Amino acid sequence: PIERVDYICERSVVVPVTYIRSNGAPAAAVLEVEGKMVALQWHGDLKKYVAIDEQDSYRWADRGGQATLSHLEADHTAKEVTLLSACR
Amino acid sequence: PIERVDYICERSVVVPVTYIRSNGAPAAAVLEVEGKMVALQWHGDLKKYVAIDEQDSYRWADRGGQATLSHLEADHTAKEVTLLSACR
Amino acid sequence: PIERVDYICERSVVVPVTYIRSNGAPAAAVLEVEGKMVALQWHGDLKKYVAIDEQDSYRWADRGGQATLSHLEADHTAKEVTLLSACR
Amino acid sequence: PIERVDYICERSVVVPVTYIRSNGAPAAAVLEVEGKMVALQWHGDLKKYVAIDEQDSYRWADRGGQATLSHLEADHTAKEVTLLSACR
C-alpha cells in the first residue's frame, strides 16, 4: 500500500509524506523536509520511522492525527531535537 | 529495501527518487518533480512506475543508467508526454 | 516593491514567483521551477525576464493573466524551449 | 544587482537566497526555507530582512560569512525564534 499524506506543522509548514506499508505493517516513509527528500524505515522497537542515512537521522513519529519530526545528530552527546509537531 | 537515488536530467534538473522494493521486486517509487512529491507504484505489465494519483499520472521508467519521467493527462485523446530523460 | 505571485501551469504545476520592481519598472523576478531557485533580470529589449545564469537561461515572460517559462541552452544551435504556459 | 547565494545551515540544510540590491543598498531577499518561497524586504532600522507577509514573518539577518533565519509569530506574546544559523 502506498499512501500520500500531507501534514501541516507550525508556521504552516507543509510536510508531504508517502507511507509505504508491507503486509499490514508500516515499512517506509518518504518525506520532504528542510528542502531534502528523506527516506525513513519503520523501526518497530522505537515505534518511529528512522532515516536510512545514519548521517542525517531524521525521525518521524506517526501518532494518528499528530506527528513529530525530530533529528539526532550522529554524536554520543547529541540528543533528539524536535524540529516540528505536525497535524494531517 | 529502501534506496535513495538522485537523477540528473536535462537542464541539470535533479530528480530525487526513493525506491522501495518488496521481496526482490520493485514496488514503489517516490520522487520530487515539478515541485510535487509523486508517489508511484510499480506496474509489472507496463514495466514502469505509475503515479497512484490517476489525475496526475506521472510515469517513471527505470532503465538502469537512464530513466524517463513521462506524464499522461487523464483523457482518451491524451498521449504520454516525455517530461525528462534522466541519468543517475 | 516586492510582490509574491503564484502561477498554476499545466499538470497543476505551481510556479511561485517573487517580482521585484524598481521605480515603476520591472527589475527582477525570482522563481522556483524544476527544483531550482532561478533569479532573473528584466530585459526591456526582449520584454522578458532572463536568468542571470547564462548557463541555465530560463526566461519568464509576464503577459498579465498568462505567463511562459522557457529555456535556452547555451548553444548557437539551441532554440528557445517552452517549458510551461502559466496562469496566475 | 541580483545575486544568488546558497547558504548551508545546521543539518546540512541548504537555504538558497536571491539578494536584490538597489543603488548600493540592500532592498530585497528571496529565499526558499521550510518548503516556502519567502520574499523579504530590507529593514535598515532592524538591519535585517523581514518577510513581506506579516502572517509568516521570517527574518533573515545577513552577517557576511554567517546568516540567521528567524521567525516571529504574529502575537504580542511571541518572541523571535531562531530557526537556522547559516554559512555561505
The answer to whether residues D74 and D55 touch, using CB atoms and an 8 Å cutoff, is yes
- The residues facing C77 across adjacent strands are none
Residue B15: closest CA among B42, B46, B36, B45: B36
Distance CA(D28)–CA(D52), nearest Å, equals: 10
Residues in chain A closer than 8 A to B27 (CB atoms):
20, 22
**Which of D18, D22, D37 has its CB closest to that of C16?**
D37
What is the resolution in angstroms? Answer: 1.9
The answer to whether residues D15 and D36 touch, using CB atoms and an 8 Å cutoff, is no
- State the DSSP code for B75: S
Q: Count the neighbouring beta carbons within 10 Å of the beta carbon of residue B73.
A: 14
A53–B2 C-beta distance less than 8 A: no
**Which of B13, B56, B71 has its CB closest to that of C34?**
B13
B32–C13 C-beta distance less than 8 A: no
B28–A20 C-beta distance less than 8 A: yes
Q: Identify the chains in contact with B, defined as 3+ C-beta pairs within 8 A.
A: A, C
Residues in chain D closer than 8 A to A31 (CB atoms):
none
Identify the experimental approach.
X-ray
The answer to whether residues C41 and C31 touch, using CB atoms and an 8 Å cutoff, is no
Distance CA(C84)–CA(C87), nearest Å, equals: 10
CA angle (D18 as vertex; C25, D72 as ends), nearest 5: 105
**Which of D2, D32, D53 has its CB closest to that of C52?**
D2
**Which of D13, D32, D56 has its CB closest to that of A11?**
D56
**Which of D4, D16, D37 has its CB closest to that of C18?**
D37
Whether chain A has a CB inside 8 Å of the CB on D35: the answer is: yes
B27–A52 C-beta distance less than 8 A: no
Distance CA(A39)–CA(A3), nearest Å, equals: 15
- The residues facing A44 across adjacent strands are none
The answer to whether residues A50 and A40 touch, using CB atoms and an 8 Å cutoff, is yes
Chain A nearest CA to D40, separation (Å): 16
- The residues facing C60 across adjacent strands are C49, C69
Distance CA(A33)–CA(D71), nearest Å, equals: 17
Identify the CATH number of the domain in which residue C35 sits.
2.40.128.200
Q: Identify the chains in contact with D, defined as 3+ C-beta pairs within 8 A.
A: A, C
The answer to whether residues C72 and C81 touch, using CB atoms and an 8 Å cutoff, is yes
Q: C35 Cβ partners below 8 Å, 6+ apart?
A: B13, B14, B15, B32, B33, B35
Is B85 exposed, middle or buried, given 0-12, 13-18 or 19+ CB atoms closer than 10 A? middle
Chain A nearest CA to B81, separation (Å): 23
The answer to whether residues B39 and A18 touch, using CB atoms and an 8 Å cutoff, is yes
- List b or e across A69-84, with b for residues whose CB sees 16 or more CB atoms inside 10 angstroms: bbbbeeeeeeeeeebb
D2–C41 C-beta distance less than 8 A: yes
3-state secondary structure of B80: coil
Residue type, A85: S
Q: D11 Cβ partners below 8 Å, 6+ apart?
A: A34, A56, A71, A73
Cell (9 digits) for C42: 528584466
Cell (9 digits) for D37: 518561497
- State the DSSP code for B78: -
The answer to whether residues C14 and C7 touch, using CB atoms and an 8 Å cutoff, is yes
Q: A76 Cβ partners below 8 Å, 6+ apart?
A: none
Is D56 exposed, middle or buried, given 0-12, 13-18 or 19+ CB atoms closer than 10 A? middle
- The residues facing A59 across adjacent strands are A50, A70
- The CA radius of gyration of chain B, in Å to the nearest whole number, is 12
Residues in chain D closer than 8 A to A56 (CB atoms):
11-12
Looking up cell 545528530 gives A73
CA C53 from chain centre, in angstroms, equals 12
Segments forming the whole domain that contains residue B27 = 2-87
Is A25 exposed, middle or buried, given 0-12, 13-18 or 19+ CB atoms closer than 10 A? exposed
3-state secondary structure of D28: strand
Chain B nearest-CA residue for C33: B34
Q: How many structural domains comprise chain B?
A: 1
Cell (9 digits) for D45: 532600522
Distance CA(C20)–CA(A38), nearest Å, equals: 33
Sign of CA dihedral C27, D35, D87, A53: negative
Q: Helix %, strand %, coil % for chain D, to 5?
A: 5, 65, 30
Residues in chain D closer than 8 A to C4 (CB atoms):
37, 39, 52-53
**Which of B3, B22, B39 has its CB closest to that of A22?**
B22
Residue C3: closest CA among D49, A83, B78, D37: D37
**What would the DSSP string read from start to end of B36-77?**
EEEEEEEETTTTEEEES-TTSEEEEEEETTEEEEEEE-SSTT
Looking up cell 529495501 gives B1
Chain A nearest-CA residue for D32: A35
Residue D61: closest CA among D39, D43, D79: D43
B2–A28 C-beta distance less than 8 A: yes
Whether chain C has a CB inside 8 Å of the CB on D53: the answer is: yes
Whether chain D has a CB inside 8 Å of the CB on C39: the answer is: yes
CA D54 from chain centre, in angstroms, equals 14
Is D85 exposed, middle or buried, given 0-12, 13-18 or 19+ CB atoms closer than 10 A? middle
